[PDB]
Ligand binder design. Structure first.
Ligand code: 3AT
Ligand code: CA
Ligand code: CA
Lengths: 445, 288
């Protein structure tokens, strides 16, 4: 009846037996695509191009043709799999484009010395053309999507200190896939470049758009609404950024990763500006004093090399006496299950680990390499990293963290360089490198 | 009367704290689908929580008709969880599972050679295995042993990062011989049949080891007495300290499962969230 008309009109041909049966269900979504006014869409994309991609040399004729060609691609596609892909991708545009992209067209200086000192003690180790335009579009995107997109990284600190040379704009969103598909289409229609959207297995809910030559355009991490709700954040220049206080904690955790320490030696000043900004932020916002008083930080960290579990003595600061930090996330997951614990607190890529307090013992996982100063001895850089990881949870659940953070920061002062004897390897993360190839009508996960 | 006040329901077998000798002397439309929907939503949400579900391929063997799977599929889809569903059964699935790019329906009886073939095809995708294979009325112990040998083969070949396996220990009086199953927690099932001793063996694999553990006749005795106690005594209780529209134990048990489920819609309390979820599920399965 009508469903047949729907499919026939969509396919621009009489639906074969095979096709009618397979597409029968998508009838409703298909109808939505058909009714969608393509001319208005062609107009919106062009309007977007004059605002963010003015320097892209392609005619209105070329843009219109790419768009109209795609909205009729089904008429020349017979492979049922490809048809499902085309229906899915067209649906994303039809239902979300105007809401996501369419709307787009309608005291550090004094802390630099402190930062240099801290970082010096730690220095003991050893991208396509479109980015410019994409970043500019993102500056706007962030202001128009406060509720579903927040920023972290150098750009967010750049909003606090204009002297920061940010490479890109790091974001966490509640609708990453939708955003990335819409943006991939926008870029495709305007530039004609066959971009590819891919998913990386060793990162959590992470997707990235790369150009035809495999150059990086932009990426995004997806997080649930509850995670978005609890992530510490600050409102600046009409956008939300992750609280610089929380970002400082992650920076400390980050240097436990051997790779990052190697980056430090390569460009010390890059990190100095970033650290100096956060140090000042915390100094002024929380009244933290850098008197060099260590107190009970960093907490004692003992590693069991055979079981890849670092025990952190937390009794001096928290209600739980110790925290068992697993280096293998699958082992942590299995052990928690064996404890009959069903409500471990998860924060996705924000912490890259669950946190469970059970019988006054915290259980969590550390996603970075653990640095050792001696055989079976955890390097102070990693002890701080582990302490920082535990404080993320404190901040995410509105617990006490101020004093501990102050002591941690102060413990980084007046330190001698300590060479790295060795380090643990991160656990293996299984999984396929998934991707969406619009040009090829392929989606594989 | 037949009332009780509880801190929480028994979520796993190991938590049942009493027994009762089985007595041979011993309700909702689509209750079977409800039972499966709840257990799989619980299992899969747990894997979501611990970062295991993200990007996985859920391979379900013995999934027909699988009506409830469509709810599971839409649920995670709406949460933006990237998953590939592969539903395999010797019989056909409910048509509401057709026409979905992200779910592959396979009508075929599985054997070792077919298992090796899909593994090679899926590799290096992270695999989550859910098995509900069955062999009628009350299979024989020999048939159950055969089913469990198959589930073990499934695991050895697929090398899943996690699995949910149908688990019902052969009755003591019909014992044949000891056998092995993977190490895992034994999840109890609300809305399971009145005197069902069936549970869900949930495993999260570490290293490349199934950690097979032995099941003895002595274990069979314990399973029978523990589950009979649960079914005869516990599940027939009204939980008076459970402030909910329905206070029967199974609803109390369902509540502790649904409270662990994620939803992007925001609610005032956990009760409001569970009530919404329960409503959504009953509506989907056509249960008043
Ligand atoms: N391995 C890690 N462990 C913990 N946190 C990390 C790790 N890697 C990155 N982060 C978090 O994200 C921040 C860095 O993202 P990143 O883009 O690599 O630095 P950046 O300052 O933005 O450098 P660019 O300006 O983009 O060149 C620092 C920290 O808050
Ligand atoms: Ca960055
Ligand atoms: Ca980035």
């Amino acid at each position: 009846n009508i469903t047949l008309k729907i499919i026939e009109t969509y396919l621009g041909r009489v639906p074969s037996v095979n096709e009618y049966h397979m597409l029968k269900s998508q009838a409703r979504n298909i109808q939505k695509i058909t009714v969608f006014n393509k001319d208005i869409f062609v107009s919106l994309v062009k309007k977007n191009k004059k605002r963010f991609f003015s320097d892209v040399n392609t005619s209105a004729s070329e843009i219109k043709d790419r768009i109209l060609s795609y909205f009729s691609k089904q008429t020349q596609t017979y492979n049922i799999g490809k048809l499902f892909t085309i229906i899915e991708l067209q649906s994303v545009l039809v239902t979300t484009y105007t809401d996501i992209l369419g709307v787009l067209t309608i005291n550090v200086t004094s802390m630099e010395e402190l930062a240099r000192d801290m970082l010096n003690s730690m220095n003991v180790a050893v991208v396509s053309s479109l980015v410019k335009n994409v970043n500019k579009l993102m500056e706007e995107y962030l202001r128009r999507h406060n509720k579903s997109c927040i920023c972290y990284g150098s750009y967010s600190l750049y909003l606090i200190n204009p002297n920061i040379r940010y490479g890109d704009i790091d974001i966490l969103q509640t609708n990453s896939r939708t955003f990335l598909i819409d943006l991939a289409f926008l870029i495709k229609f305007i530039t004609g470049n066959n971009i590819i959207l891919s998913k990386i297995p060793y990162l959590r809910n992470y997707m990235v758009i790369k150009d035809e030559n495999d150059n990086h355009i932009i990426d995004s991490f997806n997080i649930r609404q509850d995670t978005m709700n609890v992530v510490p954040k600050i409102f600046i220049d009409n956008i939300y950024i992750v609280d610089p206080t929380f970002q400082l904690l992650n920076m400390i955790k980050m240097f436990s990763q051997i790779d990052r320490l190697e980056d430090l030696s390569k460009d010390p000043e890059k990190f100095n500006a970033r650290m100096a900004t956060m140090l000042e932020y915390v100094r002024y916002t929380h009244g933290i004093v850098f008197d060099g008083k260590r107190n009970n930080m960093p907490m004692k960290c003992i590693i069991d090399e055979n079981n890849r579990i670092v025990t952190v003595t937390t009794k001096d600061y928290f209600s739980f006496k110790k925290c068992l930090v697993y280096l293998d996330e699958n082992v942590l997951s299995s052990d928690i299950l064996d404890l009959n614990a069903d409500t471990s607190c998860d924060f996705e890529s924000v912490t890259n680990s669950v946190y469970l307090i059970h019988d006054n013992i915290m259980y969590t996982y550390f996603s970075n390499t653990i640095l050792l100063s001696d055989k079976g001895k955890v390097h102070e850089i990693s002890a701080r990293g582990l302490c920082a990881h535990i404080l993320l949870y404190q901040m995410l659940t509105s617990g006490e963290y101020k004093q501990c953070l102050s002591d941690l920061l102060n413990s980084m002062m007046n330190r001698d360089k300590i060479p790295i004897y060795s380090h643990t390897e991160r656990d293996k993360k299984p999984g396929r490198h998934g991707f969406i190839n619009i040009e090829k009508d392929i989606i594989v996960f | 009367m037949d009332v009780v006040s509880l801190d929480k329901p028994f979520m796993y077998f190991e938590e049942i704290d009493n027994e009762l000798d089985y007595e041979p002397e011993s309700k909702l439309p689509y209750q079977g689908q409800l039972k499966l929907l709840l257990g799989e939503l619980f299992f899969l949400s747990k894997l979501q929580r611990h970062g295991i579900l993200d990007g996985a391929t859920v391979v379900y063997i013995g999934s027909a008709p699988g009506t409830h799977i469509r709810y599971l599929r839409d649920h995670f889809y709406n949460l933006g969880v990237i998953i590939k569903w592969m539903l395999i059964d010797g019989r056909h699935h409910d048509p509401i599972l057709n026409g979905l790019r992200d779910v592959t329906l396979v009508t075929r009886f599985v054997d070792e050679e077919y298992l090796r073939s899909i593994k090679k095809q899926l590799h290096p995708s992270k695999i989550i295995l859910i098995s509900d294979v069955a062999s009628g009325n009350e299979p024989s112990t020999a048939d159950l042993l055969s089913n469990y040998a198959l589930q073990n083969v499934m695991i050895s070949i697929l090398n899943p990062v996690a699995s949910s396996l149908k688990w019902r220990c052969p009755f003591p009086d019909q014992w044949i011989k000891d056998f092995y199953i993977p190490h895992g927690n034994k999840m109890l099932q609300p809305f399971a049949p009145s005197y069902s001793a069936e549970m869900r063996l949930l495993s999260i694999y570490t290293g490349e080891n199934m950690r097979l553990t032995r099941v003895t006749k002595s274990d069979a005795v314990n399973y029978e007495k523990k589950m009979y106690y649960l079914n005869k005594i516990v599940r027939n209780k009204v939980v008076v300290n459970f402030d909910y529209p329905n206070q029967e134990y199974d609803y109390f048990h369902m509540y502790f499962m649904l409270r662990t489920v994620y939803c992007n819609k925001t609610f005032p309390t956990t009760k409001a969230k569970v009530l919404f979820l329960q409503q959504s599920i009953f509506r989907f399965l056509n249960i008043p």
